[PDB]
Amino acid sequence: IQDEFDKVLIPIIMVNGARKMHIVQYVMNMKLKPLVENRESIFEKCYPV
Amino acid sequence: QRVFINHLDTYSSGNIGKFLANCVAGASLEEGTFQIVGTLVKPESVKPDFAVEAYKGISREDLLSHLMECDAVIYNITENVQQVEEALWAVSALNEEISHFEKRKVFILLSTVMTWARSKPLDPDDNEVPFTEEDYRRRKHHPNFLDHINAEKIVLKFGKNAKKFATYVVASGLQYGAEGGILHTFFKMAWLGEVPALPVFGDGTNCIPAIHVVDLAGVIQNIIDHVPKLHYLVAVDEAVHTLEDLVKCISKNTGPGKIQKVPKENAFLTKDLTQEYLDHLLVNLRMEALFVKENFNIRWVAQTGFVENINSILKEYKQSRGLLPIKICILGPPAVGKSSISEE
Amino acid sequence: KERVMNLPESVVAGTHYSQDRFLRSLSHYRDINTDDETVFNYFDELEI
């Protein structure tokens, strides 16, 4: 299925479940959080000059 | 089966009773409790839960009754003057009980090697020759202990009934384990450790033959089951440690290891060091419980010595007041409050 | 911030608690102790 994600080239993240689960929760929360907060900005590429 | 010992709120009696309760009669002959009854030293004390008897003072009639009630009786007269007179009364009234006896009953008295303080050896030149359960007959006195010796001898006068009635007396080395008062004091000293070197007394090279309360209790049960045919036995370790070794060990493990040898007069200042304890500091003795060591099928704690078992003995003492070290860190912002609270 | 600013100017004089130092250290304190990871995690794994 990861190879299928290659074929589509969708975003993939992975996180480790061996830590106590609330740590893992915080980690995937933290990584997802920019995507949601930005989401109003879908693309919005910008350029320093 | 039912056994008396006096003053169980002394560790010496108390822990013997504790272990003697858990063991089983006759078992000592091999390599569910008893019933145990006891007097308290202190009205502050309360019945040990291995024991069931309660007498903040006992009626002498009640005492004599319970002395008949027991299968065996032990008494101890170390430290206590009054216990000597009471045991003498007990054994005298027991002479009547010998006529009353349900069975040949057992009496035991607990006593210290300190009785031997003032002794010519058998070999005053080979000063390392040991002496045994045979030799105490010799034991050259020390003054209070000489009255103890008198009570011992009187107890053997009644002992002469032998097959009709058994009496026994035992000489104990210095007592160690179970918060034992002298080592407790030196434990207390090293636990605070505030002096950079811990005090040591005159020569200090004097050997103090010693027994541990559990191994003494085992000896007592072995005597009870055996009913040994010699009516005095010695209770001392092979350790042969000098007091110098004792304090060196104590300071090394607990303290700085550093130690200082000082006039005994400097020790005399101390509160819990009764003159009895200072005398224990004075004594050299050299004896071996050969009769026990042949006869008695003890499963030891260890036959060896305090210096070796020191780690276990300290662990016992630390449990005795639960003084397990407390160990903390607290996390967050810095300094103000944080350090303040930590220091509080 | 209030407590620190309320510290005597003499007390704070040149200290790590001078406001620039205080601010930077406070941030650094948070930045290290991510809920992703903290020193606590070692003891948490010991479950003490």
Short mmCIF file of C-alpha atoms in Angstrom, two decimals:
data_model
loop_
_atom_site.label_atom_id
_atom_site.label_comp_id
_atom_site.label_asym_id
_atom_site.label_seq_id
_atom_site.Cartn_x
_atom_site.Cartn_y
_atom_site.Cartn_z
CA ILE A 1 0.00 0.00 0.00
CA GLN A 2 2.95 2.32 0.60
CA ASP A 3 4.05 1.41 -2.92
CA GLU A 4 0.60 2.44 -4.09
CA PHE A 5 1.19 5.74 -2.27
CA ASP A 6 4.32 5.96 -4.41
CA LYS A 7 2.16 5.55 -7.49
CA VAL A 8 -0.20 8.33 -6.39
CA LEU A 9 2.65 10.18 -4.60
CA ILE A 10 0.26 11.24 -1.80
CA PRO A 11 1.71 12.55 1.48
CA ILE A 12 2.73 9.80 3.89
CA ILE A 13 3.92 10.22 7.48
CA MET A 14 4.85 7.47 9.92
CA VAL A 15 5.01 7.54 13.72
CA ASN A 16 6.12 4.97 16.29
CA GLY A 17 3.62 3.35 18.65
CA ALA A 18 6.16 1.99 21.14
CA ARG A 19 6.14 5.13 23.26
CA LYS A 20 3.29 5.54 25.73
CA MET A 21 0.27 6.27 23.63
CA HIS A 22 -0.33 9.86 24.72
CA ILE A 23 3.17 10.77 23.49
CA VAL A 24 2.37 9.16 20.15
CA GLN A 25 -0.91 11.06 20.08
CA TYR A 26 0.87 14.34 20.71
CA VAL A 27 3.36 13.59 17.94
CA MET A 28 0.84 12.83 15.20
CA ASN A 29 -1.28 15.73 16.48
CA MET A 30 1.72 18.02 16.12
CA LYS A 31 2.50 16.86 12.59
CA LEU A 32 -1.13 17.05 11.42
CA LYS A 33 -1.69 20.43 13.10
CA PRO A 34 0.15 22.60 10.53
CA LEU A 35 -1.79 20.92 7.72
CA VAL A 36 -5.13 21.79 9.33
CA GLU A 37 -4.16 25.28 10.51
CA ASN A 38 -2.60 26.14 7.16
CA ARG A 39 -5.44 24.51 5.29
CA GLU A 40 -7.09 27.82 4.42
CA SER A 41 -3.81 28.30 2.57
CA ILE A 42 -3.95 25.26 0.29
CA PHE A 43 -0.88 26.11 -1.78
CA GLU A 44 -0.01 29.81 -1.66
CA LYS A 45 3.64 29.59 -2.71
CA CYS A 46 5.62 32.74 -1.90
CA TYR A 47 9.06 34.05 -2.69
CA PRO A 48 11.74 35.96 -0.76
CA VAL A 49 13.68 38.41 -2.90
CA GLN B 1 3.17 -25.79 73.41
CA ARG B 2 3.67 -22.83 75.72
CA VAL B 3 6.79 -20.86 76.68
CA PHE B 4 7.50 -17.82 78.86
CA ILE B 5 10.13 -15.16 78.50
CA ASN B 6 10.27 -11.91 80.48
CA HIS B 7 10.54 -8.34 79.24
CA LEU B 8 9.78 -8.98 75.57
CA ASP B 9 10.00 -5.24 74.81
CA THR B 10 13.71 -5.75 75.16
CA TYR B 11 14.96 -6.76 71.72
CA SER B 12 16.95 -9.54 73.38
CA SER B 13 13.84 -11.27 74.69
CA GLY B 14 11.45 -9.88 72.11
CA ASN B 15 13.06 -11.14 68.92
CA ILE B 16 13.91 -14.50 70.47
CA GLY B 17 10.23 -14.87 71.30
CA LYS B 18 9.35 -13.72 67.79
CA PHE B 19 11.48 -16.41 66.15
CA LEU B 20 10.78 -19.06 68.80
CA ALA B 21 7.06 -18.57 68.15
CA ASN B 22 7.48 -19.25 64.43
CA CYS B 23 9.56 -22.42 64.90
CA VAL B 24 8.21 -25.85 65.85
CA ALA B 25 9.06 -27.98 68.88
CA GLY B 26 11.64 -30.71 68.32
CA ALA B 27 12.40 -29.35 64.84
CA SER B 28 15.81 -28.16 66.06
CA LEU B 29 16.92 -31.80 66.19
CA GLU B 30 16.61 -31.85 62.41
CA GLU B 31 19.03 -29.79 60.33
CA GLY B 32 1.56 -23.73 63.81
CA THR B 33 3.06 -21.38 66.37
CA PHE B 34 3.99 -21.91 69.96
CA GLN B 35 2.06 -20.04 72.62
CA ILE B 36 4.37 -17.34 73.99
CA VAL B 37 3.84 -15.31 77.16
CA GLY B 38 5.83 -12.38 78.42
CA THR B 39 6.31 -9.43 80.73
CA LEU B 40 6.87 -5.84 79.63
CA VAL B 41 9.67 -3.60 80.85
CA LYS B 42 7.72 -0.43 80.13
CA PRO B 43 4.05 0.40 80.83
CA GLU B 44 4.52 2.25 77.54
CA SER B 45 5.09 -1.12 75.85
CA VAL B 46 2.30 -3.31 74.49
CA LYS B 47 1.90 -7.04 73.84
CA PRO B 48 4.10 -8.20 70.93
CA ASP B 49 1.86 -9.80 68.34
CA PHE B 50 3.88 -13.02 68.43
CA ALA B 51 2.98 -13.14 72.15
CA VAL B 52 -0.31 -13.25 74.01
CA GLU B 53 0.04 -12.19 77.61
CA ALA B 54 -0.63 -8.85 79.29
CA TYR B 55 0.73 -7.90 82.73
CA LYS B 56 1.98 -4.38 83.47
CA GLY B 57 3.28 -6.03 86.55
CA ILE B 58 2.00 -9.56 87.20
CA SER B 59 0.52 -11.07 90.32
CA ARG B 60 3.22 -13.33 91.73
CA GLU B 61 0.53 -16.00 92.01
CA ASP B 62 -0.33 -15.38 88.35
CA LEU B 63 3.35 -15.59 87.42
CA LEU B 64 3.74 -18.91 89.26
CA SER B 65 0.59 -20.21 87.57
CA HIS B 66 1.83 -19.33 84.09
CA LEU B 67 5.26 -20.75 84.97
CA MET B 68 3.43 -24.01 85.51
CA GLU B 69 1.42 -23.37 82.33
CA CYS B 70 4.50 -23.25 80.11
CA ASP B 71 6.22 -26.32 78.72
CA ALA B 72 9.50 -24.40 79.07
CA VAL B 73 10.59 -21.13 80.67
CA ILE B 74 13.50 -18.83 79.95
CA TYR B 75 14.52 -15.74 81.90
CA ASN B 76 17.05 -13.01 81.17
CA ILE B 77 18.85 -10.89 83.76
CA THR B 78 21.21 -8.81 81.62
CA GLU B 79 20.83 -5.14 82.53
CA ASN B 80 18.00 -5.73 84.98
CA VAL B 81 18.49 -6.17 88.73
CA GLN B 82 14.83 -6.87 89.50
CA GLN B 83 14.61 -9.72 86.99
CA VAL B 84 17.27 -11.51 89.06
CA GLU B 85 15.26 -11.40 92.28
CA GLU B 86 12.05 -12.30 90.45
CA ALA B 87 13.68 -15.28 88.75
CA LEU B 88 15.01 -16.44 92.14
CA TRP B 89 11.49 -16.26 93.59
CA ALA B 90 10.18 -18.07 90.51
CA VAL B 91 12.67 -20.94 90.77
CA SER B 92 12.02 -21.29 94.51
CA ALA B 93 8.25 -21.49 94.07
CA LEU B 94 8.93 -23.81 91.12
CA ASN B 95 10.56 -26.16 93.62
CA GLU B 96 6.99 -26.65 94.86
CA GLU B 97 5.84 -26.96 91.26
CA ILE B 98 8.39 -29.76 90.83
CA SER B 99 6.13 -31.64 93.23
CA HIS B 100 3.14 -30.33 91.27
CA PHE B 101 4.74 -30.90 87.85
CA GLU B 102 2.59 -32.17 85.02
CA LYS B 103 5.96 -33.13 83.51
CA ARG B 104 9.63 -32.38 83.83
CA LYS B 105 9.57 -28.69 82.91
CA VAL B 106 12.49 -26.68 81.55
CA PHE B 107 13.96 -23.50 83.00
CA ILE B 108 16.59 -21.35 81.30
CA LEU B 109 18.44 -18.19 82.31
CA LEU B 110 20.13 -15.80 79.87
CA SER B 111 23.44 -14.28 80.90
CA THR B 112 26.57 -12.72 79.42
CA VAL B 113 30.24 -13.65 79.02
CA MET B 114 30.93 -10.35 80.80
CA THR B 115 30.93 -12.60 83.88
CA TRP B 116 34.36 -13.79 82.66
CA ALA B 117 35.94 -10.32 82.63
CA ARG B 118 38.57 -10.72 85.36
CA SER B 119 40.00 -14.06 84.27
CA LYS B 120 43.37 -15.67 84.33
CA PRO B 121 43.53 -17.85 81.20
CA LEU B 122 44.39 -21.52 81.32
CA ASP B 123 47.42 -20.45 79.25
CA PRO B 124 48.24 -16.83 80.19
CA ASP B 125 51.08 -16.98 77.62
CA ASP B 126 49.32 -18.53 74.61
CA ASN B 127 46.64 -15.87 75.06
CA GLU B 128 44.82 -17.23 71.97
CA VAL B 129 43.75 -20.49 73.65
CA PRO B 130 39.92 -20.59 73.63
CA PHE B 131 37.60 -21.64 76.43
CA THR B 132 34.29 -23.43 76.37
CA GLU B 133 31.07 -24.48 78.11
CA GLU B 134 33.35 -26.51 80.39
CA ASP B 135 35.41 -23.49 81.47
CA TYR B 136 32.75 -21.06 82.72
CA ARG B 137 32.95 -22.91 86.04
CA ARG B 138 36.14 -20.85 86.27
CA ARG B 139 34.66 -17.53 85.19
CA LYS B 140 36.41 -14.79 87.18
CA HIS B 141 33.78 -12.30 88.14
CA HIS B 142 32.68 -8.75 87.52
CA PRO B 143 30.80 -7.17 90.39
CA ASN B 144 27.16 -6.85 89.32
CA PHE B 145 27.55 -9.94 87.14
CA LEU B 146 28.81 -11.77 90.22
CA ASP B 147 25.30 -11.37 91.61
CA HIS B 148 24.09 -12.63 88.25
CA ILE B 149 26.53 -15.52 88.77
CA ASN B 150 24.94 -16.12 92.18
CA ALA B 151 21.49 -16.38 90.62
CA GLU B 152 22.91 -18.70 87.96
CA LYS B 153 24.42 -20.99 90.59
CA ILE B 154 21.23 -21.00 92.66
CA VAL B 155 19.35 -21.98 89.50
CA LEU B 156 21.72 -24.95 89.17
CA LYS B 157 21.12 -25.82 92.83
CA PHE B 158 17.49 -26.34 91.87
CA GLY B 159 18.76 -27.88 88.62
CA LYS B 160 20.17 -30.80 90.59
CA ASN B 161 16.68 -32.32 90.36
CA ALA B 162 17.73 -32.91 86.73
CA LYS B 163 15.57 -35.84 85.58
CA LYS B 164 12.71 -34.51 87.71
CA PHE B 165 13.30 -30.88 86.73
CA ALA B 166 15.68 -29.17 84.30
CA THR B 167 17.35 -25.78 84.69
CA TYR B 168 19.79 -24.15 82.31
CA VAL B 169 21.86 -20.98 82.04
CA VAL B 170 23.65 -19.49 79.05
CA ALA B 171 26.48 -17.00 78.63
CA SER B 172 25.94 -14.73 75.63
CA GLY B 173 28.60 -12.76 73.86
CA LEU B 174 27.79 -9.19 72.90
CA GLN B 175 24.40 -9.18 71.21
CA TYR B 176 24.20 -7.98 67.62
CA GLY B 177 21.42 -7.59 65.14
CA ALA B 178 17.92 -6.38 65.93
CA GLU B 179 18.84 -2.80 66.83
CA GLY B 180 21.27 -4.08 69.46
CA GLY B 181 21.85 -1.24 71.81
CA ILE B 182 25.60 -0.70 71.52
CA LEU B 183 25.70 -1.24 67.76
CA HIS B 184 22.56 0.89 67.56
CA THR B 185 24.48 3.68 69.27
CA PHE B 186 27.34 3.25 66.81
CA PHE B 187 24.81 2.92 64.01
CA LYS B 188 23.28 6.19 65.22
CA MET B 189 26.72 7.82 65.29
CA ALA B 190 27.63 6.72 61.78
CA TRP B 191 24.14 7.51 60.49
CA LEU B 192 24.65 11.11 61.52
CA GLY B 193 28.35 10.78 60.74
CA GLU B 194 28.95 14.39 61.70
CA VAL B 195 32.44 13.88 63.13
CA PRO B 196 35.02 13.37 60.35
CA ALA B 197 36.52 10.44 62.28
CA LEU B 198 34.64 8.15 64.63
CA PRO B 199 35.85 7.46 68.14
CA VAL B 200 37.65 4.35 69.36
CA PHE B 201 38.61 3.48 72.87
CA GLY B 202 42.10 3.01 74.29
CA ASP B 203 43.47 -0.20 72.84
CA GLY B 204 40.26 -1.38 71.14
CA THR B 205 42.12 -4.56 70.14
CA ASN B 206 40.01 -6.44 72.72
CA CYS B 207 38.06 -9.32 71.18
CA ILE B 208 34.35 -9.37 71.99
CA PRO B 209 32.78 -12.81 71.43
CA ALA B 210 29.23 -12.18 70.29
CA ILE B 211 26.00 -13.84 69.22
CA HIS B 212 23.15 -12.67 66.99
CA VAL B 213 19.68 -12.69 68.50
CA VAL B 214 18.28 -15.14 65.95
CA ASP B 215 21.16 -17.57 66.37
CA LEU B 216 20.80 -17.28 70.15
CA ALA B 217 17.09 -18.06 69.81
CA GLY B 218 18.01 -21.12 67.76
CA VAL B 219 20.49 -22.12 70.47
CA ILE B 220 17.71 -21.74 73.04
CA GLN B 221 15.36 -24.01 71.09
CA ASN B 222 18.20 -26.50 70.55
CA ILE B 223 18.80 -26.58 74.32
CA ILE B 224 15.07 -27.02 74.94
CA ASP B 225 14.63 -29.94 72.55
CA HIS B 226 17.99 -31.55 73.39
CA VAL B 227 17.78 -30.94 77.13
CA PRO B 228 21.60 -30.97 77.03
CA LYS B 229 23.33 -32.98 79.72
CA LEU B 230 25.57 -30.06 80.71
CA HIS B 231 23.46 -27.34 82.30
CA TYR B 232 25.45 -24.34 81.06
CA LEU B 233 26.14 -23.38 77.45
CA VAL B 234 28.07 -20.58 75.76
CA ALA B 235 26.62 -18.38 73.00
CA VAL B 236 29.41 -16.66 71.04
CA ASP B 237 30.54 -16.35 67.44
CA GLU B 238 33.67 -17.49 65.63
CA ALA B 239 34.10 -13.87 64.45
CA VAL B 240 36.82 -13.26 67.07
CA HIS B 241 36.64 -9.62 65.97
CA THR B 242 38.41 -7.07 68.08
CA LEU B 243 36.41 -3.97 68.91
CA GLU B 244 38.96 -2.23 66.69
CA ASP B 245 37.65 -4.35 63.82
CA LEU B 246 34.05 -3.64 64.83
CA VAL B 247 34.45 0.13 64.70
CA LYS B 248 36.70 0.02 61.64
CA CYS B 249 33.97 -1.93 59.84
CA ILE B 250 31.22 0.40 61.05
CA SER B 251 33.03 3.54 59.91
CA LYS B 252 34.14 1.92 56.65
CA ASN B 253 30.65 0.90 55.56
CA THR B 254 28.53 3.67 57.06
CA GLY B 255 31.02 6.34 58.09
CA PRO B 256 34.07 7.88 56.43
CA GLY B 257 36.16 4.85 57.30
CA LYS B 258 38.26 7.39 59.20
CA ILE B 259 38.53 6.60 62.90
CA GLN B 260 40.24 7.91 66.04
CA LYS B 261 41.40 6.07 69.16
CA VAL B 262 40.70 8.10 72.29
CA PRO B 263 40.76 7.77 76.08
CA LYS B 264 37.75 5.73 77.18
CA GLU B 265 36.96 8.67 79.47
CA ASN B 266 35.96 10.50 76.31
CA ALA B 267 33.36 7.79 75.70
CA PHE B 268 32.15 7.99 79.31
CA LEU B 269 30.45 11.30 78.45
CA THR B 270 27.85 9.57 76.31
CA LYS B 271 24.23 9.13 77.36
CA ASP B 272 23.16 5.72 76.07
CA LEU B 273 26.59 4.29 76.97
CA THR B 274 25.65 2.98 80.37
CA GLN B 275 28.54 1.75 82.48
CA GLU B 276 27.44 -1.75 81.44
CA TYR B 277 28.12 -0.84 77.82
CA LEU B 278 31.43 0.79 78.73
CA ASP B 279 32.38 -2.44 80.49
CA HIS B 280 31.50 -4.26 77.28
CA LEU B 281 33.98 -1.92 75.62
CA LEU B 282 36.58 -2.91 78.22
CA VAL B 283 36.33 -6.68 77.96
CA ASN B 284 38.52 -9.04 76.02
CA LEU B 285 37.31 -12.64 76.01
CA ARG B 286 38.23 -15.67 73.90
CA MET B 287 35.71 -18.53 73.97
CA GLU B 288 34.05 -20.93 71.55
CA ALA B 289 30.70 -22.71 71.98
CA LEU B 290 32.09 -26.13 71.11
CA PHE B 291 29.26 -27.98 72.88
CA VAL B 292 26.66 -26.06 70.87
CA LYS B 293 28.69 -26.35 67.68
CA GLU B 294 28.80 -30.14 67.93
CA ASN B 295 25.27 -30.76 69.21
CA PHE B 296 23.10 -28.08 67.71
CA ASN B 297 21.69 -28.52 64.19
CA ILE B 298 21.09 -24.82 63.59
CA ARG B 299 20.34 -23.41 60.17
CA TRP B 300 22.45 -20.30 60.76
CA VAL B 301 22.00 -16.79 59.59
CA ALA B 302 25.76 -17.06 59.40
CA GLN B 303 28.20 -18.75 61.77
CA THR B 304 30.90 -16.24 60.88
CA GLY B 305 30.96 -12.66 62.13
CA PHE B 306 29.44 -9.21 62.26
CA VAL B 307 32.17 -7.72 60.06
CA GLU B 308 31.24 -10.11 57.25
CA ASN B 309 27.45 -9.97 57.57
CA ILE B 310 27.63 -6.19 58.03
CA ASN B 311 25.57 -5.40 54.94
CA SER B 312 22.63 -7.50 56.13
CA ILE B 313 22.97 -6.16 59.68
CA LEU B 314 22.88 -2.56 58.46
CA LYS B 315 19.88 -3.42 56.29
CA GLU B 316 18.13 -4.70 59.42
CA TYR B 317 19.02 -1.54 61.32
CA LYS B 318 17.81 0.74 58.53
CA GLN B 319 14.52 -1.15 58.49
CA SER B 320 14.41 -0.83 62.29
CA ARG B 321 13.60 2.87 61.80
CA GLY B 322 12.77 2.60 58.09
CA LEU B 323 15.44 5.20 57.31
CA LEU B 324 15.38 4.57 53.56
CA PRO B 325 16.91 7.62 51.85
CA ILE B 326 14.55 10.10 50.22
CA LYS B 327 15.41 11.06 46.70
CA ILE B 328 13.85 13.90 44.74
CA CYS B 329 14.02 16.11 41.70
CA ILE B 330 11.44 18.70 40.65
CA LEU B 331 11.29 20.21 37.21
CA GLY B 332 10.17 23.33 35.39
CA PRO B 333 11.29 26.96 35.44
CA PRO B 334 14.40 27.91 37.43
CA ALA B 335 15.66 29.48 40.59
CA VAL B 336 13.11 31.60 42.46
CA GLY B 337 10.48 29.43 44.07
CA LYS B 338 12.05 26.35 42.54
CA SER B 339 15.26 26.50 44.55
CA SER B 340 13.41 28.05 47.48
CA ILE B 341 10.87 25.20 47.62
CA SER B 342 13.64 22.64 47.19
CA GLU B 343 15.51 24.07 50.17
CA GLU B 344 12.28 24.25 52.20
CA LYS C 1 7.14 37.23 33.57
CA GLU C 2 5.42 39.26 36.28
CA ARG C 3 7.35 37.65 39.13
CA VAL C 4 10.65 38.10 37.29
CA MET C 5 9.96 41.72 36.39
CA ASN C 6 8.92 42.21 40.02
CA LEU C 7 12.29 40.92 41.21
CA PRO C 8 14.49 43.75 42.56
CA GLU C 9 16.64 45.37 39.91
CA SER C 10 19.59 44.83 42.24
CA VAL C 11 18.64 41.16 42.57
CA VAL C 12 18.35 40.72 38.80
CA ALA C 13 21.52 42.74 38.15
CA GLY C 14 23.45 40.91 35.44
CA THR C 15 21.70 37.65 36.31
CA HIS C 16 20.39 34.97 33.97
CA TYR C 17 17.07 36.58 34.96
CA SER C 18 17.77 39.88 33.23
CA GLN C 19 14.81 40.07 30.93
CA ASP C 20 16.60 39.09 27.72
CA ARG C 21 18.27 36.11 29.39
CA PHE C 22 15.06 35.22 31.23
CA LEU C 23 12.97 35.30 28.05
CA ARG C 24 15.46 33.23 26.06
CA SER C 25 15.87 30.64 28.83
CA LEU C 26 12.09 30.40 29.33
CA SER C 27 11.60 29.73 25.63
CA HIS C 28 14.46 27.21 25.64
CA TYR C 29 12.83 25.49 28.64
CA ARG C 30 9.59 25.07 26.70
CA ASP C 31 11.38 24.13 23.47
CA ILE C 32 13.28 21.28 25.13
CA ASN C 33 10.24 19.91 26.95
CA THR C 34 8.09 19.17 23.96
CA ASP C 35 5.08 17.07 24.82
CA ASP C 36 6.65 15.00 22.05
CA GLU C 37 9.58 14.49 24.41
CA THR C 38 10.74 15.55 27.86
CA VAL C 39 13.15 14.39 30.54
CA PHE C 40 10.00 13.16 32.31
CA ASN C 41 9.70 10.45 29.65
CA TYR C 42 12.53 8.46 31.25
CA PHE C 43 10.71 8.25 34.59
CA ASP C 44 7.40 7.70 32.81
CA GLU C 45 8.93 4.66 31.12
CA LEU C 46 10.01 3.53 34.59
CA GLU C 47 6.37 4.32 35.51
CA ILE C 48 7.55 6.01 38.71
#
